[PDB]
Ligand SMILES: [Cl-]
């Protein structure tokens with residue numbers, strides 16, 4: 001089932017319950033590796049007709065955001081937001097085909113490895129979240145010259161510009177994700193130096 005984060009507890013959500021809750025919304029967005037969930041709080045506030053789901057393997061930083069969104073609207077609550085505990089390697093089947101848009105913003109650790117190497121098992125799982133014709137956007141600011149040791153630690157020692165035009169594109173394509181050619185929540189987390197290293201990768205679910 002879907003592990004909904006409700007403060008410092010989990011509530012199990014069935015597919016039926018999830019479908020009824022998203023059923024009145026024009027679009028569904030999933031933020032994978034949401035971290036503290038700020039992207040979800042910002043997007044749900046900005047887009048009342050979008051249902052926004054933030055997913056992270058670590059629920060602890062989402063305990064308080066998940067309380068904040070439950071308040072009545074005049075106290076800042078967001079009935080179009082939801083936080084879920086899950087790892088990208090083991091996403092719940094109840095989320096299959098739910099999302100018009102999936103974002104992976106400034107991933108770290110295993111999720112950064114998964115989207116840049118990439119790890120095809122994680123790519124297939126991300127693809128399964130997306131409705132046919134929906135979109136995935138991966139945003140990273142890791143710098144090949146400043147972050148050499150972090151890249152090595154993550155198994156990303158072989159990243160080159162040619163990788164992003166060939167092997168990576170083909171791996172995403174084989175997983176059903178076809179490639180498509182800063183005042184955002186994630187842009188506000190970047191130092192000036194990191195801003196020059198931003199790479200945005202966009203794909204359509206096919
Ligand atoms: Cl963010």
Ligand code: NA
Nearest residue numbers: 032033104105
């Ligand atoms: Na993200």
